[PDB]
Amino acid sequence: EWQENKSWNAHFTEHKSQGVVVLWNENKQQGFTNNLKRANQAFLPASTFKIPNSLIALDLGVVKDEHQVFKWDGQTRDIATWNRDHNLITAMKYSVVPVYQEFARQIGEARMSKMLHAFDYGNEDISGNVDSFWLDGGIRISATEQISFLRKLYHNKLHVSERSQRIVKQAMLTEANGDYIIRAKTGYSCRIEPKIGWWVGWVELDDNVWFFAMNMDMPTSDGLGLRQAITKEVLKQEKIIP
Amino acid sequence: SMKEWQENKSWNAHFTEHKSQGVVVLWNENKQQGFTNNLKRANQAFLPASTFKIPNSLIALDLGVVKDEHQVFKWDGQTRDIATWNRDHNLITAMKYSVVPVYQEFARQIGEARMSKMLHAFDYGNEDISGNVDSFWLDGGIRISATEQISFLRKLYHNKLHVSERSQRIVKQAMLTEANGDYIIRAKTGYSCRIEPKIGWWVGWVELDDNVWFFAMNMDMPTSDGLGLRQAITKEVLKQEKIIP
Ligand SMILES: [Ca+2]
Ligand SMILES: [Cl-]
């Protein structure tokens, strides 16, 4: 079931914003959120789509392994970290859109649609550019739907090879210490209103796993760090992390 | 500057500062070159102690003794000195807390014949497991040097060991120790505390955006009070060489 804890809204309004956090306790099969309506509202996934895009590119052989080098095309884009060679690990880390646009072109519309239907990923609608539909096209996915998809990935239940799922979970690694491991992906939907930031993933503990998906209003890029900061505030307050 | 192995005695100051002695060995994967404060000790073979949990994990996975990283190894109900051992574990947490009893059971199930054959294929150390099948890495005959640990770890990193790619990916997951926006460390600690010379170990690697740095260190450990020096001295070297900030 789901519990709504409206008191968590303060975590957003104290930053002059609005948003949703969704938590899932895997051992207890219990969900929590500050806002049930928005937890189930579907938005563009923006660069959180790099999780399914990575899986499809690996399973089909577009990407051989996490070491294959994708050479910079020599065109200088706005984010300096994009203007260099990458592998799957660093393309995820710096959210290198052009590398993933090339993945999508090579996958093709037909195979992309077939795979997203098999994943049950959002509204499964890739209209718009084959190479940008997750940024300004027709695909929409909610925070609760992100949890469902991530749970399948965590348990190697998606209809792609076990190897592809293990490689993407490695590439999602974001933080690790003696208390917890976070595997996750950020997103920033900055073209189509409502402009929002995403953070989706999970926290591995010794004894349990907490899945999470959050999004928040993002009228400018100045607030992007609040995606992880707000989430961690909630995790700390609830004694999931120290 | 073309030498495969180069001695840099300036790192000794990190040992001297902590009234300690030992060896740090680094390997720059992009440049295929190595660095150490003590070439002689870098090539001296010691009991691996709990750094042996890396090969032991690989063998148990590949033979099916361990199904995967979620299988639960129930506590046998016997209360031992390290409190974190006295509970149920999986591969991730058994590696993290270095739960010896779990891996002793692994070794008994693998058996001496299959254990010997696998270490031979791994070319691991002196490949000699005389002693108890269940404790030879703690007080038996197997010995491995720091440079030999590097070579073995490089094989693991590239999935070049003879076991399945899946077994190798799982163990590399279980070796995860630290990760942030600057680096990822996959490593395993050890403490040889039964047979002289008593020593501590830390072996593994540091993943950067555009390179990997393998490391293996051991140091004299007359009592357990200095165990934190294994990571501290290693990190002091990594900082001096600008590998981590
Ligand atoms: Ca595959
Ligand atoms: Cl990992």
Residue numbers in the entry:
A (entry chain A): 24 to 265
B (entry chain B): 21 to 265
Sentences from the paper on this structure:
The active sites of class D carbapenemases such as OXA‐48, which is of major clinical importance, uniquely contain a carbamylated lysine residue which is essential for catalysis. Unlike other classes of SBLs, class D catalysis requires carbamylation of a lysine residue, which occurs through the reversible reaction of carbon dioxide/bicarbonate with the lysine ϵ‐amino group. We report the application of 19F NMR spectroscopy to investigate carbamylation of the class D SBL OXA‐48, a major clinical cause of carbapenem resistance. Crystallographic studies on 19F‐labelled OXA‐48 provide a structural rationale for the sensitivity of the 19F label to active site interactions.
We anticipated that a 19F label situated near the active site of OXA‐48, which has no cysteine residues in its wild‐type sequence, would be sensitive to its carbamylation state, so enabling the factors influencing this post‐translational modification to be investigated by 19F NMR spectroscopy. Thr213, which is positioned on the β5‐β6 loop, is poorly conserved among class D SBLs. As OXA‐48 T213C* was judged to more closely resemble the wild‐type enzyme (although, as noted, the 19F‐labelling did apparently impact kinetic behaviour), it was chosen for subsequent 19F NMR studies. Notably, unlike our crystal structure of 1,1,1‐trifluoroacetone (TFA)‐labelled metallo‐β‐lactamase SPM‐1,18 clear electron density representing the TFA label was observed in the OXA‐48 T213C* structure. The trifluoroacetone label is present in its hydrated (diol) form in the crystalline state. Hence, our 19F NMR studies in solution likely represent, at least normally, the hydrated state of the TFA label. Comparison of the OXA‐48 T213C* structure with the structure of a carbapenem‐derived OXA‐48 acyl‐enzyme complex implies the overlap of the TFA label and elements of the carbapenem acyl‐enzyme complex. Consequently, the 19F label must be displaced from this position following substrate or inhibitor binding, as manifested by changes in the 19F NMR spectrum (3 C). The presence of the 19F label in OXA‐48 T213C* close to the active site likely causes the observed changes in kinetic properties when compared to wild‐type OXA‐48. However, since these differences are relatively minor, and as the carbamylation of the 19F‐labelled enzyme behaves similarly to what was previously observed for wild‐type OXA‐48,5 the presence of the label does not appear to have a major impact on carbamylation and enzymatic activity, suggesting that the positioning of the label in OXA‐48 T213C* is dynamic, and does not obstruct access to the active site.
